[PDB]
């Protein structure tokens, strides 16, 4: 039959950079042009996800950073830049003829540490409030799967029954902060890169900050094409 | 500030049909040809799902159905067919320009419809086994979203962390099955047309049959170009 060989066994790239993975075949699975070998992705404990099928060609659903290249019995495959849930392992298969055949894959694993854990990014947020006319809150949201220096971390407000409002970012690398005019000096926040939390506090409230604010990072090596992944969402209330 | 505009408020689909939803920008939002609307589904008490980035771009693990289109100014999200599953508030978001606007949103809603039928292709597989060696297990492997009887029904095998192992296939509509050499008077691949399940069995056990089981549809009518769905997998174990 024919027997993919992929390299390396064992990847770890630092987030946001390239990737490089090969399977080589011994045979040509190569047919007029058309390699019959498909990418994999597997999560930890989950079934094998098809990404790219026939060398070059993206599943629908997978971005572009996913390249799909080889000729022969020569294949590569490449993700660039590498994001966080991207931890997994990587298979090759062939299906030029049968027995239809795997390769050994590459686990990959994001240099950011942790023999434990992949991937799966998640946010929590601090607990539902009840607050009174007066009052002031400052809402947490901790982050994990992903260091918060490399992304921006909004907050946006969301009244009952109504759109979303965002409200501002900041930046934990360098602590620069944007909030939109209306929010300047209202809402201020904040970020403890040794706690790896993003804070976000609201004064002097008003029936008018009832609502459920949620916390999503997007800006860099993290969420850079559009909100994927949103806190739960902390809910405050304000009541007279 | 670039104020989105979403329509109608909201709106009522039979399930089955089309459902289409516009989001207009009062001033473009387009890049050197690239529309930074996004698109995402919300359901009462969670947060905004990520469903459509840039103008069209299908967000990885959202179904086919969902659409995404427009230029500059005027943008359509277009669910087709509606599934139930679908009920709940769709928003646009602009990343143009801080602060990133959202629009009002729109509610779709199911009406009374006399029709719909339109199940994903989903693969269900038995539960975890536990058993002596020697003795001989068997999986099941139950599909819905198609028939089985329109293409092959392949198993692949996933010993405790390492590759996949193409076992072999069955064809639903003739008992024809094909096992790769190795697996001949150990594996035994049958299917029953009308329960439109699968059935894996492997005889007198071993400790290096300990592994991970998945069901895979491929060929013909159902995934024909590469193994693009899979069952989530029996785990099977042997220690007495």
């Known amino acids: 039959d024919i027997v993919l060989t992929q390299s390396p066994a064992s990847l770890a790239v630092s987030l946001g950079q390239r990737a490089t993975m090969s399977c080589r075949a011994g045979?040509?699975?190569?047919?007029?042009?058309?390699?019959?070998l498909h990418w994999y992705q597997q999560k930890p404990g989950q079934p094998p996800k098809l990404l790219i099928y026939?060398?070059?060609n993206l599943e629908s659903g997978i971005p572009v950073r996913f390249s799909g290249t080889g000729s022969r019995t020569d294949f590569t495959l490449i993700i660039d830049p590498v994001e966080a849930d991207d931890v997994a392992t990587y298979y090759c298969?062939?299906?030029?003829?049968?027995?239809?055949?795997f390769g050994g894959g590459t686990k990959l694993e994001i240099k950011g540490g942790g023999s434990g854990g992949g991937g799966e990014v998640q946010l929590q947020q601090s607990g539902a409030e009840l607050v009174e006319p007066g009052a002031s809150v400052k809402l947490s949201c901790?982050?994990?799967?992903?260091?918060?220096?490399?992304?921006?971390?909004?907050?946006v407000k969301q009244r009952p029954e109504q759109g979303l409002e965002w409200?501002?970012?900041?930046?934990?690398?360098?602590?620069?902060?944007?909030?939109?005019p209306k929010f300047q000096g209202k809402a201020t926040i904040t970020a403890d890169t040794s706690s790896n939390t993003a804070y976000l506090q609201l004064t002097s409230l008003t029936s008018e900050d009832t609502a459920v604010?949620?916390?999503?990072?997007?800006?860099?090596?993290?969420?850079?094409?559009?909100?994927?992944?949103?806190?739960?969402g902390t809910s405050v209330t304000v009541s007279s | 500030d670039i104020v989105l505009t979403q329509s109608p408020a909201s709106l009522a689909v039979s399930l089955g049909q089309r459902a289409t939803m516009s989001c207009?920008?009062?001033?473009?939002?387009?890049?050197?040809?690239?529309?930074?609307?996004?698109?995402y589904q919300q359901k009462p008490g969670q947060p905004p799902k990520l469903?459509?980035?840039?103008?069209?771009?299908?967000?990885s693990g959202i179904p086919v159905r969902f659409s995404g289109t427009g230029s500059r100014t005027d943008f359509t999200l277009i669910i087709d067919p509606v599934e139930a599953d679908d009920v709940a508030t769709?928003?646009?978001?602009?990343?143009?320009?801080?602060?990133?606007?959202?629009?009002?949103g729109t509610k779709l809603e199911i009406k009374g419809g006399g029709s719909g039928g339109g199940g994903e292709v989903q693969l269900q597989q038995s539960g975890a086994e536990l058993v002596e060696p020697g003795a001989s297990v068997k999986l099941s492997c139950t599909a819905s979203?198609?028939?089985?009887?329109?293409?092959?029904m392949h198993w692949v095998k996933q010993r405790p962390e390492q590759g996949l192992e193409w076992i072999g296939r069955?064809?639903?509509?003739?008992?024809?099955?094909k096992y790769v050499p190795k697996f001949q008077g150990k594996a035994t691949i049958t299917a029953d047309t009308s329960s439109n399940t699968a059935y894996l069995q492997l005889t007198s056990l071993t400790s290096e049959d300990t592994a991970v089981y998945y069901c895979?549809?491929?060929?013909?009518?159902?995934?024909?170009?590469?193994?693009?769905?899979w069952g989530q997998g029996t785990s099977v174990t042997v220690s007495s």
């Open positions: 895979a549809p491929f060929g013909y009518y159902v995934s024909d170009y590469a193994m693009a769905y």
């Open positions: 979203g198609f028939n089985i009887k329109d293409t092959y």
């Open positions: 069955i064809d639903p509509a003739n008992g024809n099955s």
């Open positions: 045979e040509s699975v190569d047919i007029f042009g058309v390699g019959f």
């Open positions: 026939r060398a070059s």
């Open positions: 298969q062939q299906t030029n003829e049968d027995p239809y055949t």
